């Protein structure tokens, strides 16, 4: 939204940024001065007010200061410096509020006159943005609406001269006209380029020797931050005038500022008893106003919601701080957490609600001595086991409880709480039942949703006609239809799927606030769309306004951005509207009735479509319209399109704060524009009768919600007092059309079934499947990646390498730091032998055919095996059985002699005897000196010193040592067990330790011959031996 | 990155991004490659040999995994493939 | 489909004893539906001498805080009924009793054979007769025990020894997803 900001920086950006031909003298002239800062330093670095005389200024939000006599004018620095003892440090009250002083402002004075004082301002509107100039600065202005000159520029154009020479600027002097016909120009780019919405210059001194300006009002547009992150550098947003934010609430803030999902806390006094954490804004607001309606005007101490489905951990962190400040008193008469919501529609209440159950789980000491219990009424997307699971973790804890749901009221349980209840051409028609629709992205979900809306209201074919997404090409994407597959194709631009889709007349955009308005002029660039619904919620209002004109000026109606969408029930819904089948099902939105509401909130439509579900034949049309300054369509107009629309016997209508759309649905009905019976009820009743509400911008008494709802209710609106008889009011006005015979209801018929997702009855927990795989070695669901049962942060802090994330992988056990070591050594050692091997060989011919490094590396390693590689399996293996046994090497020596086998592991082409072979000698002598045991590799070396006596060069080869080793290591290092170990060997981990140091020989391979830019190969004739057959 | 965090907060650097992005510079700045040398390491795919050297560990740990679990032979259940065979051709 | 029926899934007040296995569910949806819910129901098996009689169990109840009434049902055969009624006279079981004999027939029958039985002081009728005027609310036969044992709870309800606890959905079982 819009939010104000320091005079600092409005006024470093308006010297910044300005581009005007007049000069403007005092630029980059300022002195922000605050009791935490050093004299010398401001003094030092920023000299140059010594030279003149000095103004000094409060600058923590508060209008009107002139009269309240906090501004300084003729004072030196010395008086300067003296005249904050009095005000400074305490307490200053204006009007009802009260705050401390700690930062003021310091400007150069300058001599000027009425005759030079003006006054400027230029503040948004959703026709555009009214510029006014006012003669007479100063604290004379008095009224500035009805006596300042008007003047208004449209939406997306520019100011041409003629207005502000004869239409803006008629009672100024003639060169200071001519002067400010430019200056005021230019102050209007800037209001443009940087996306503000109330721009304030009182008063305005315009001299010979330039432009001054003294107070400064900017509220700029929050929103926009995405678009002028250049243009603002660090801007900062103070909060109004009051007690200052606590701590937590400013940790609450960043919150909603780490994601999408909206979280919104407010406080007055945390002595009070009645503390609400409910979800959804305007089901906040409803919730507050009914505290304060029946006995609960001062008790109530809370202010906020949670929207926009907060994950687990936004939910985790709000329960928290909320708990947090729940213990810090001790209240004799009691406590109570009231905690309700309506039936949300995309808010994922499990997940909500885990987080909430989660809090409370670890947080249960200071909870139960301050006598608190808990009242908590919610609904929306499984909502089971939100009045399930608490059931037991609130009696378990130690906490009284009373859970409800969707079949009591939203608002009984205040009632409950505090005893007064017992405790138990714009068209007229948008959507049809064969109107088709363009979703804009990816949203798998919430177009399965619309397709099973349409399958219960026995459509004849799908809602959704085609999707589309940028980022992927063009295909078609599997969907349900009741039990059976359809295909929707999803396109990757816009312009195809409505030249190949001519029927589609809605379109349903799931852009980001960054993408929506690109895509919703291109969408109004085809006429064919008469309806946009725009999901986003974050856009500017600018580009909003754009939106807007261009939608007017093509005849296109816009369901207004940050909203849900709306429901047509029997004909088509807007995305997530109305939650999913469960709540169509339970609210009997498949079929048509005969009530059409409008609203803001998309929370409280679903609430709506309850109500007027069970007191009333159902619901015929609902429109959420979007929480923005500037809805696509407002109230007014879907009243219109009701009151137009013969199926439609009543209307509802949810308004707001602020606006007076209301009042246009009042003179509607005093003409007689509007016949059919209209139930209206405003909320936010507390705005007049509470500290502050930031949940809107109402400006005078006469947009609150007391006085819509008066000047509805004796206008021919049947307004109830407040939201506890809404309904009762919606079934009186049902009964009397049914008894005037107005409205006939049909009888209830079954609507068609459909099968539930396998998906999500596995978040419900209604089904068993058996697993057909089974792992061990890594699991990588959870948060951090974990091997075999330990993280991968902790493999990383205790300095494991290669050989230890190996030992987990492949054994799943901690090896001590000698073993993992060694595995790294025996992966060095084989790392490569040369390309004359048949693997290196292979890779290199697979590498010289053009192929990449997964086949060629995979060419090379698909000859390691018996002949090949398979050298360390094998000695390992014989040596284990012939040492299993008693026999002594010599006789193991005869064994292998008379069975016509070489003992593998044995022998060398060089390296006899004096020049040993030099990667056993590293391997030999690291596992001496490390190992704990070795009884393998003595077997193995005593059979060394008998086979280098038959000949010299029958050494111990690095196979042989390395399976000996690693056989001695899986036995000796105490993680394995024989059987273990023994089990290790037969299943080949051996093989796999050569395969994994040969593998990056390999690719070395493949990697050096493409660096070559060697050609194909192909074997010479002459190395070749041809013996075929004669004829055969 | 942060650019896209401030569009959406999960549009975080991955393993992927963080280890190319990391290796590039170390072939770059290491001080043993010319700029050549390392844009030609990285086309012949270098890094490609990384993850596959990385993932050969967890593939061999994998085998021996389902070796030590006396996995049987795996059919795939009919319920999970949807045959569409034309009806005569 | 049985255990929710019957609300088996959480803590209750009543626990009983007996022999036969189809009565034991019966009498949980009986009580269960006339009354809070059953704390602990148990059979021991219709055989001579199973491994533990009536009035250990019934002690067992006595004993734990967590049952507040208990409920008998007798058999033809066996003078385990008047022993009961014995340890009851003297004050060692003080939590109401509400008992009911089955076998009534075996007086008004040719021949009953589903026990052995010996005398007439020994068979059905005579358990009951005992057991009314022994302290245990017995009716004439299985048919009214409804708003003989209901009334019991609202008894103990008006007395204020019994706290209802309203009831708490479950988390229910998944089934077979083929
Ligand atoms: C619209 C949106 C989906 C936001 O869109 P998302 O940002 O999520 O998805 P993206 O379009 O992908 O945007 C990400 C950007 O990063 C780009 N990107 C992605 N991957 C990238 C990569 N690898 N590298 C580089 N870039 C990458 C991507 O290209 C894009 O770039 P760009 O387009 O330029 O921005 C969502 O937020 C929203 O508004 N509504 C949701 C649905 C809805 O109907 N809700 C209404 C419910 S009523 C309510 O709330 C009240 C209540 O709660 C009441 C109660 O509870 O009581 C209830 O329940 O009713
Ligand atoms: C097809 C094509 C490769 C012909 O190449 P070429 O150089 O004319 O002939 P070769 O590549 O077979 O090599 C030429 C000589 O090498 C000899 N040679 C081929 N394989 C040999 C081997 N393994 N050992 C020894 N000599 C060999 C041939 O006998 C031939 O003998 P010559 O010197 O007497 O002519 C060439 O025309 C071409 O690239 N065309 C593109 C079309 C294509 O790619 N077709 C695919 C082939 S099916
Ligand atoms: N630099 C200045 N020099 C002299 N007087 C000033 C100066 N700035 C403000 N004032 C006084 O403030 C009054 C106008 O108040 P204005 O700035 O329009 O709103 P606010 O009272 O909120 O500051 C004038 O009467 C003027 O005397």
């Not at 025996?826 to 790392?831: I, K, N, Q, S, Y």
């Not at 330790?993 to 593998?999: H, P």
């Amino acid at each position: 939204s819009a939010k104000a900001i320091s005079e600092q920086t409005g006024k470093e950006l308006l010297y910044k940024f300005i581009c005007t031909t007049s000069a403007i003298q005092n630029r980059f002239k300022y002195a922000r001065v605050t009791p935490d800062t050093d004299w010398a330093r401001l003094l030092q670095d920023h000299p140059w007010l010594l030279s003149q005389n000095l103004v000094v200024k409060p600058d923590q939000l508060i209008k009107r200061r002139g009269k309240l006599g906090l501004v300084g004018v003729n004072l030196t620095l010395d008086g300067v410096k003296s005249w904050l003892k009095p005000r400074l440090g305490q307490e200053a009250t204006v009007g009802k509020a009260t705050g401390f002083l700690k930062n003021f402002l310091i400007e150069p004075f300058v001599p000027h006159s009425q005759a030079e004082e003006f006054y400027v301002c230029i503040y948004a509107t959703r026709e555009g943005d009214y510029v006014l100039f006012h003669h007479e600065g100063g604290v004379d202005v008095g009224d500035v609406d009805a006596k300042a000159q008007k003047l208004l520029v449209g939406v997306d154009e520019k100011l041409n001269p003629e207005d502000i020479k004869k239409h803006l600027l008629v009672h100024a002097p003639e060169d200071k006209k001519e002067i400010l016909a430019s200056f005021i120009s230019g102050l209007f780019n800037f209001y443009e380029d940087l996306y503000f919405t109330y721009l304030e210059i009182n008063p305005l001194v315009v001299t010979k020797d330039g432009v001054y300006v003294l107070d400064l009002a900017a509220k700029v547009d929050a929103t926009a931050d995405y678009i002028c992150k250049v243009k603002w550098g660090d801007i900062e947003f103070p909060p109004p005038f009051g007690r200052e934010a606590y701590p937590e609430e400013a940790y609450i803030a960043d919150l909603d500022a780490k994601s999408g999902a909206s979280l919104k806390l407010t406080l007055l006094n945390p002595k009070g008893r009645i503390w609400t954490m409910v979800a959804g804004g305007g089901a906040s607001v409803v919730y507050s106003d009914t505290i304060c309606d029946l006995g609960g005007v001062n008790e109530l101490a809370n202010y906020g919601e949670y929207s926009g489905a907060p994950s687990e951990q936004q939910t985790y962190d709000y329960a928290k701080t909320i708990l947090s400040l729940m213990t810090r008193e001790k209240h004799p008469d009691g406590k109570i957490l009231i905690i309700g919501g309506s039936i949300a529609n995309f808010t994922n209440v499990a997940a909500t609600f885990k987080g909430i159950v989660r809090a409370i789980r670890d947080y249960q000491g200071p909870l139960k001595e301050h006598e608190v219990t808990i009242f908590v009424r919610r609904g929306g997307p499984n909502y089971q086991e939100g009045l399930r699971v608490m059931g037991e973790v609130g009696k378990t804890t130690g906490i009284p409880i009373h859970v409800f749901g969707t079949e009591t009221h939203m608002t009984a349980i205040v009632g409950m709480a505090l005893g007064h209840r017992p405790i138990p051409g714009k068209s007229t028609t948008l959507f049809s039942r064969h109107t088709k629709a363009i979703v804009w992205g990816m949203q798998t979900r919430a177009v399965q949703g619309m397709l099973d809306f349409d399958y219960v209201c026995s459509r004849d074919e799908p809602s959704v006609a085609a999707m589309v997404y940028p980022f992927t090409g063009d295909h078609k994407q599997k969907f349900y239809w009741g039990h059976k597959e359809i295909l929707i194709p999803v396109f990757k631009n816009m312009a195809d799927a409505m030249r190949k889709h001519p029927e589609v007349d809605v379109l349903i955009n799931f852009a980001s606030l960054r993408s929506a308005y690109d895509s919703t002029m291109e969408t109004m660039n085809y006429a064919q769309i008469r309806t946009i619904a725009i999901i986003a919620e974050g856009i500017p209002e600018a580009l909003t306004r754009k939106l807007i004109k261009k939608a007017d000026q093509k005849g296109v109606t816009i369901i207004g951005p940050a909203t849900v969408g709306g429901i047509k029930p029997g004909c088509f819904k807007i995305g997530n509207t109305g939650g999913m089948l469960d709540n169509i099902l339970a609210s009997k939105l498949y079929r048509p009735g005969s009530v059409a509401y409008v609203s803001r909130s998309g929370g409280m439509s679903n609430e709506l479509n309850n109500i007027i579900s069970r007191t009333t034949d159902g619901v015929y049309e609902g429109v959420a319209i979007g929480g923005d300054r500037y809805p696509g369509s407002t109230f007014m107009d879907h009243v219109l399109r009701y009151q137009d629309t013969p199926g439609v016997k009543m209307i509802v209508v949810l308004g707001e704060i602020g606006g007076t759309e209301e009042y246009k649905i009042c003179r509607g009905i005093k003409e007689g524009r509007l016949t059919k019976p209209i139930v209206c009820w405003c909320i936010g009743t507390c705005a007049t009768m509470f500290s502050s509400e930031v949940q809107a911008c109402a400006n005078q008494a006469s947009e609150t919600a007391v006085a819509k709802n008066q000047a509805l209710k004796e206008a021919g609106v049947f307004v109830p007092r407040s939201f506890d008889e809404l309904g009762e009011i919606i079934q009186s006005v049902y009964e009397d059309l049914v008894a005037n015979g107005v409205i006939v209801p049909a009888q209830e018929v079954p609507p068609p079934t459909v099968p539930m997702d396998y998906s999500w009855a596995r978040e419900l927990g209604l089904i068993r499947k058996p697993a057909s795989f089974m792992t061990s070695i890594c699991d990588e669901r959870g948060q951090e990646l974990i091997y075999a049962g330990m993280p991968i942060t902790e493999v990383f802090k205790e300095e494991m390498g290669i050989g230890g994330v190996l030992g987990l992988l492949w054994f799943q056990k901690r090896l001590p730091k000698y073993s993992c070591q060694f595995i790294e050594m025996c992966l060095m050692v084989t790392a490569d032998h040369g390309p004359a091997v048949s693997g290196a060989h292979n890779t290199i011919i697979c590498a010289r055919a053009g192929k990449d490094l997964v086949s060629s590396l995979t060419s090379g390693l698909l000859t390691i095996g018996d002949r090949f590689g398979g050298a360390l399996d094998a000695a390992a293996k014989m040596f284990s059985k012939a040492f299993d046994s008693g026999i002594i090497p010599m006789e193991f020596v005869n064994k292998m002699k008379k069975e016509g086998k070489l003992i593998m592991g044995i022998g060398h082409r060089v390296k006899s005897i004096n020049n040993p072979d030099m990667r056993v000698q590293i391997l030999k002598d690291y596992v001496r000196q490390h190992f704990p045991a070795t009884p393998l590799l003595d077997y193995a070396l005593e059979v060394e010193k008998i086979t280098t006596s038959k000949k010299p060069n029958l050494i111990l080869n690095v196979a042989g040592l390395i399976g000996v080793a690693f056989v001695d290591m899986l036995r000796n290092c105490g993680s394995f067990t024989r059987e273990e170990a023994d089990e290790y060997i037969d299943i080949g981990a051996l093989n796999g330790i050569f395969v994994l140091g040969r593998s990056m020989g390999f690719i070395g391979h493949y990697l050096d011959q493409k660096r070559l830019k060697q050609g194909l190969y192909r074997h010479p004739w002459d190395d070749i031996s041809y013996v075929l057959p004669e004829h055969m």
